Amino acid sequence: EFYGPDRAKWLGPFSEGSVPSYLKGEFPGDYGWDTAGLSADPETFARYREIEVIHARWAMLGALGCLTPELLQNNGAADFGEAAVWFKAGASIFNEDGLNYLGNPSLIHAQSIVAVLLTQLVIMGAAEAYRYSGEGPVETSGDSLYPGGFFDPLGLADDPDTLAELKVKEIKNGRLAMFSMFGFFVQGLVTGKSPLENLADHLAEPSVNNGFASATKFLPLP
Amino acid sequence: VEWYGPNRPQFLGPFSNPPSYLKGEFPGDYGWDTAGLSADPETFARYRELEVIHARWAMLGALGCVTPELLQRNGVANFGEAVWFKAGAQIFQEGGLDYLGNPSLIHAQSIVAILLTQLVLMGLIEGYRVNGGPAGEGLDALYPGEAFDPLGLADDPDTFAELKVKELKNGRLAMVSMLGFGVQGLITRKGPIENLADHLAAPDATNFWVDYAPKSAGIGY
Amino acid sequence: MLTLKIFVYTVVTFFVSLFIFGFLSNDPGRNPGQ
Amino acid sequence: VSRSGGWLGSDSQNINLDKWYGPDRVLYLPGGLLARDEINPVLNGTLPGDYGYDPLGLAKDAETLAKYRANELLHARWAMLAAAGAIIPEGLAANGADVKGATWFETGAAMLNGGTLNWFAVPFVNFNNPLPLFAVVAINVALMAAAENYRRTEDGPAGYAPGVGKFDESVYSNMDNLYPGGPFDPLGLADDPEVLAELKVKEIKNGRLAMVSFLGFAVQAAVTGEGPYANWSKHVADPFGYNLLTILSSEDRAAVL
């Protein structure tokens, strides 16, 4: 159903003639969608698949991270101020009290923009360099995209049949996260309010408070 | 070996897993094709030519985008608009466009003459570059030499190979700086030389992260 | 009177267009000699 | 592969040497006025710019023609440098540039009494050239005397030129007295024999144009007393009001009516 010839497709029942020959349902997420033939060459397809999974994984982290502080702010679990909104959390580091995790000054209490940036360059630079290398001190399998071993403490990938199906779950939850993250970016740019405030307004008046309410917000003026 | 072959340097230092198609056969091969854009040998060839042409243009642009401003800041010369993203507007000023401010140089007055002449001049030049012409035909596309290497600095094959790597590395650095000029100019709205002076004057207060980053969402710059 | 003017403009243009494209239709070839 | 090519696309290189060399070479008079058998036989169409023009029969043999062609090419090349160099600095001053001694026939006086000249590297900064008159006379004479003696003796010192890199005295051997090439052709535009033959025609033709032009610059200086740029700028400004006839008039012509 998610692999092989009769797998699910991007156009559903009407996707017989739209599936490229190079897409044969061998990898996770193969709904036969490449109307631009960008993955015709096998080598470029493999690299694009890695980029998609890495993006999908960052988006799943990003989608959860862009809502968790705001949810805590709403129910009263913590206080962030303007930093509750995801597209305003950056300036927090420039607050006199500093970026306090969960609003607690006894936590990180970071003050230096340089320090948070240089630290990330060293850490993520090392972590990403090992990923590109394909080798490292940790124990991994031969698949760079799917290391396992050290990165699979719970043996959820041990069963090979479940691993193939769980791969579809990762990319499908991942692609939804990427689409929603693009929604967070555009809604932040267009509406200027947090994603949960956008949701609340749609619920308050769905027929009026929708995207077309801001359709004329960027009319070029003479 | 140092700049070509399997012992060449890589974009990620020790962590080096060069793509198979990247075999250190061309200048500036640090094994960086993580997106796999140049997997096709024909496309890679086309991409290498674009990089060299972009690099040479960027090198001319980077020097040309600071030279009028450096002369102005140092009081060496007066320009109608020294800042690069404002130099084009000089044609619409009163006396027109005077080179180095001296009314006896160029003294251009109409943008149509500038545009039409550039269309003819650059149209022939680029045609000569791709189809060959007065300077020669059958010459290498990216490294023609001959009339374009009068000093013969590329006579030694070994020196030519190393100097080609230098061209890309200086060129790639120039391309990054050009993006910086554009982004910095679009944000600071000030010339790049002036921006550098500001950072040197008070780096902890005029940095982008402190000066504009906090006003990039909900508040204007 | 505008209705009359538009009608005449339509009519005059029609006959002039036939005259123009009539002579553009290989007129010189329409002769009985060879 | 070639170092030469056309200017207007593929197959745009059409160098016709027949019009400038050989029996059908163009002549100073058209076909219906001058028959080709009336041309001096010593002018056989082997030298650049052989328009078959030599009244008074000055060239009566190949040696005499070769000796005079050595003179013509040198007088032509100097006139090309002079024509360009006599009017370019004056045009700068008339347009606002700071040039002392703009007109060519007044630059010498500017160096008198210890005065100096400003050399304009036109695209870029100007220079307050410190060389005094005594020094300029000494350096110019020394460099020119040495340069001309090397041409006269057909031998010179070893040195560097970009086209040939580093060369020794051996290169001076086997150099044409008029078309040395080698170090004197850094861009290597003389490689193609057909291109070289055509470019030789352009050299004397631009050269002969320059020689007659400088003659006018001199005659015009004596008559109008102004620089060549001033004469041109005012002919273009008011052509019928400012020409030779108006100057010769030298009086307010009474209205005829």
Binding site: - | - | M1, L2, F14, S25 | -
Partner: protein
């Protein structure tokens, strides 16, 4: 005034176009006639028995 008139006399209007509707009257008619002419050129030339090359047309 007492009556209504076009009042376009002696006003120097291009092609006498006082109102934009006259433009559509001329343009539509010319396009139609040009349209039927355009799709018939090949047939008309075919009668000549020659192809409309660089040597076509009455020539003495």
């Amino acid at each position: 005034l007492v009556d209504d008139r076009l009042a376009g006399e002696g006003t120097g209007k291009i092609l006498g176009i006082n109102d934009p509707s006259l433009f559509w009257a001329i343009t539509i008619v010319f396009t139609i006639v040009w349209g039927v002419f355009y799709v018939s050129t090949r047939e008309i030339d075919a009668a000549s028995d020659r192809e409309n090359d660089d040597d076509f047309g009455l020539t003495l």
